[PDB]
């Protein structure tokens, strides 16, 4: 119990012992602590409870010091001393923002406000906190036992009475017993079973509570800002294709590390793998949280990297298939790619963080624990969506709070800004760049004069709490009919649910606004499906309409973005 102070890391014997986490406080910040919030006990290697027999006195304002032991006000003898006296508690080497984190719920925005705005060490003990909590929080669910197996993806399943039901969409990836991870979609439910084994009738399934470790490197480095490019050898011989990027690689090597805020399409994996090419003796560790990021990253090294230097890091508890081109598992290649929860414990010269926006202050301190680099390039878009925060369900969480690097980009700005979109028809660019991008987001290509908007509010029903909107997918199939060219669309939609509906009548492909992060197609055709805070939100909006290279359907709920939308409108 010998440690170092969350506040002021003065040595202490003391630890907050109503803390999830322990922090170790010293005597005089445990003292603020115990005597303004209902944390009052206190932890050393005895802790701090009245020694009498069968007393429960464990509150550290109610007792005392006799001799080498601990009392209470009924069992001190004459000659004692308060634990807690002139702003101190009692302990060897003798904070309104750490009382919040330290009992806050994490239900409302204000806690990840205050996450994000605290010292370095707090949104450490914050995002450990946070974290534990969240994980405490799948302990409080319904188990369910398989009833049924009706084919090879569809199945019938008896819940848990008493405990409530978690939410049935592509956001609560189960553990089913060992037989692998499994999720579910909307009495016919949807199994997706990560391992292809037979659902024995009898079997269960659980949400996967993992353990949270303690975080001990900040979420950002402190910066460093050199007068040469520092331990990183540039050539002169850059392919045009990556000429665009040379001030900004420069930058990179210039600083301890960076932030880019790239749009939708504007050269993010381009950027990233470029550096690569600008100091071709760099080892790169590309880390990203998700395996679609990193194997997107991983595609664009395939083009333009040597396949024998590559290395995509793949987990023993390997959850779900991702990019098979790369030697696998071999941590000594110049270019890695891993997971941010796979990464070992290595060096690099360039540590390139990508989809920033989807980073917790969680992960970005892990990275910076597990990768020593000499360079960390933070790549992603405030503008874009950010990681769910399962507990949160009071406020909505804004771009600045998403973790360390948002809150940089949105108040300091991004150090590089990749300012032309080369994806979308300039209708998309024009929209998105005066909704999120202060109108500095440039189109590349002209107007396609295949992107469409539709006002229609339909009829919203539920499937528990995600919505279905019936009559847009009704207009998206009268639309189908008379636009033949649309057949090859992929469907958007804010809701799961919606997205199984529109599989079933229309049998278009299907994404919701969060997975379609990072991906493009041709055709996109987006039903709105309600008008709430989730349906409505200028990040998801954003993402949404800019996930088409050429045409776009908006089937629209909300008068204000149907009215944003720079596109042709339709009547029906
Ligand atoms: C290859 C790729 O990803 N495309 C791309 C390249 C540039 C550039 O050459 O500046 C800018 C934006 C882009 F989306
Ligand atoms: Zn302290
Ligand atoms: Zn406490
Ligand atoms: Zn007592």
Not at 361 to 368: C, I, K, Q
Not at 440 to 453: G, N, P, Y
Request: glycine fraction near 6%.
């Amino acid at each position: 119990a010998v440690g170092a102070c969350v506040l002021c890391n003065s040595q202490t014997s003391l630890r907050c012992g109503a803390c999830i986490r322990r922090p170790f406080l010293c005597c005089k910040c445990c003292y603020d602590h115990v005597i303004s919030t209902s944390h009052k006990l206190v932890l050393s290697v005895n802790p701090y409870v009245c020694n009498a027999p069968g007393c429960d006195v464990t509150d550290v304002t109610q007792l005392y010091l006799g001799g080498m032991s601990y009392y209470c006000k009924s069992h001190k003898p004459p000659i004692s001393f308060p634990l807690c006296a002139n702003g101190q508690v009692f302990g060897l080497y003798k904070v309104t923002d750490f009382n919040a984190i330290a009992t806050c719920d994490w239900t409302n925005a204000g806690d990840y406000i205050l996450a994000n705005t605290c010292t370095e060490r707090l949104k450490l003990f914050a995002a450990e906190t946070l974290k534990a909590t969240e994980e405490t929080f799948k302990l409080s669910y319904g188990i369910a036992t398989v009833r049924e197996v009706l084919s090879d993806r569809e199945l019938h399943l008896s819940w848990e009475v008493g405990k409530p039901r978690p939410p049935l969409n592509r956001n609560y990836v189960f553990t089913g017993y060992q037989i692998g991870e499994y999720t579910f979609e909307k009495d016919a439910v949807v199994y997706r079973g990560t391992t292809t084994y037979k659902l024995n009738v009898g079997d269960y399934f659980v949400l996967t509570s993992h353990t949270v470790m303690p975080l001990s490197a900040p979420t950002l480095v402190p910066q460093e800002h050199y007068v040469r490019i520092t331990g990183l050898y540039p050539t002169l011989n850059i392919s045009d294709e990556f000429s665009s990027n040379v001030a900004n690689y420069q930058k990179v090597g210039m600083q301890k590390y960076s932030t880019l805020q790239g749009p939708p399409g504007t050269g993010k994996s381009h950027f990233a793998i470029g550096l690569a090419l600008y100091y071709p003796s760099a080892r790169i560790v590309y880390t990203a949280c998700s395996h679609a990021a990193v194997d997107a990253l991983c595609e664009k090294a395939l083009k333009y990297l040597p396949i024998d230097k590559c290395s995509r890091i793949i987990p023993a508890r390997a959850r779900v298939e991702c990019f098979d081109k790369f030697k696998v598992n071999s941590t000594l290649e110049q270019y890695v790619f891993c997971t941010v929860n796979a990464l070992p414990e290595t060096t690099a010269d360039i540590v390139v963080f990508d989809e920033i926006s989807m980073a917790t202050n969680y992960d970005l301190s892990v990275v910076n624990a597990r990768l020593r680099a000499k360079h960390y390039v933070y790549i992603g878009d405030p503008a874009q969506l950010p990681a769910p925060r399962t507990l949160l369900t009071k406020g909505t969480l804004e771009p600045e709070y998403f973790n360390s690097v948002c809150r940089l980009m949105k108040t300091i700005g991004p150090d590089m800004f990749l300012g032309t979109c080369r994806r979308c028809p300039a209708e998309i660019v024009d929209t998105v760049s005066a909704l999120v991008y202060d109108n500095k987001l440039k189109a590349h290509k002209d107007k396609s004069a295949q992107c469409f908007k539709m006002f229609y509010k339909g009829v919203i029903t539920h499937d528990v709490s995600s919505a279905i909107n019936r009559p847009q997918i009704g207009v998206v199939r009268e639309f189908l009919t008379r636009n033949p060219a649309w057949r090859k669309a992929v469907f958007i939609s804010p809701y799961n649910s919606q997205n199984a509906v529109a599989s079933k009548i229309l049998g278009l492909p299907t994404q919701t606004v969060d997975s379609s992060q990072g991906s493009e197609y041709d055709y996109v055709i987006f039903t709105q499906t309600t008008e709430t805070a989730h349906s409505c939100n200028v990040n998801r909006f954003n993402v949404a309409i800019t996930r088409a290279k050429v045409g776009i359907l908006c089937i629209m709920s909300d008068r204000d973005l149907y009215d944003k939308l720079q596109f042709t409108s339709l009547e029906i």
